[PDB]
């Protein structure tokens, strides 16, 4: 197929790994890898909550989330040695900014 | 010569204490918990629960997912290297 279709698609396994393979069912007391991402969720909350601060402020906190996830992922998979980037891919980058 | 009777008519103390509030949430907080988390279900298996229980469950916080991880991309790219020549 092609390249950058089939790094899309490896972004969206790792997303979906990350809050499925990372704790059993949910435990509360909490597992190893999951306690990163709810460092992350915490500093980003309690970022713009700083930020925009409004009401809404939670209503861009999932968006603020995935536009964070979504070039963390992205710049360790162009980071390996053999790939082939998509943020390197800077047409959908601009694009993206452009659109928000 | 008048003997009262109030210490006998007592019931709002027996309301009026404050556990009260607290028995009535954990006699149902309790009686449908897990006797001492037993675990709800413990059998797994399709040969990446396995994977799961010694990487992605409180087991190792090693670095050996990363690699695992890692390494199928360096394969991806580097056969492609060879699909492409």
Do not use: C
Not at chain 1, 29 to 40: C, H, M, N, T, V
Not at chain 1, 45 to 68: A, D, E, H, S, V
Not at chain 2, 8 to 35: D, T
Not at chain 2, 51 to 63: L, R, T
């Amino acid at each position: 197929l092609t390249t950058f279709s089939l790094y899309t698609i490896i972004v969206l396994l790792v997303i979906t790994s990350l809050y499925t393979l990372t704790n059993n069912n949910n435990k509360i007391i909490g597992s190893r890898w999951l306690i990163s991402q709810e460092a992350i969720y915490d500093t980003i909350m309690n970022m713009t909550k700083g930020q925009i601060g409004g009401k809404n402020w939670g209503l861009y906190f999932p968006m603020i989330f995935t536009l964070f996830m979504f070039i963390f992922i992205a710049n360790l998979i162009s980071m390996i040695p053999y790939s082939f980037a998509l943020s390197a891919h800077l047409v959908f980058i601009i694009s993206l900014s452009i659109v928000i | 010569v008048s003997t009262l009777i109030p210490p006998k008519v007592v019931s709002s103390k027996n309301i009026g204490s404050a556990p009260n509030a607290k028995r009535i949430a954990n006699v149902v907080h309790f009686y449908k918990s897990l006797p001492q988390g037993p675990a709800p279900a413990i059998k797994a298996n399709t040969r990446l629960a396995r994977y799961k229980a010694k990487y992605f469950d409180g087991d190792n916080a090693s670095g050996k997912p990363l690699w695992h991880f890692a390494l199928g991309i360096i394969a991806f790219g580097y056969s492609m290297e060879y699909y492409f020549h």
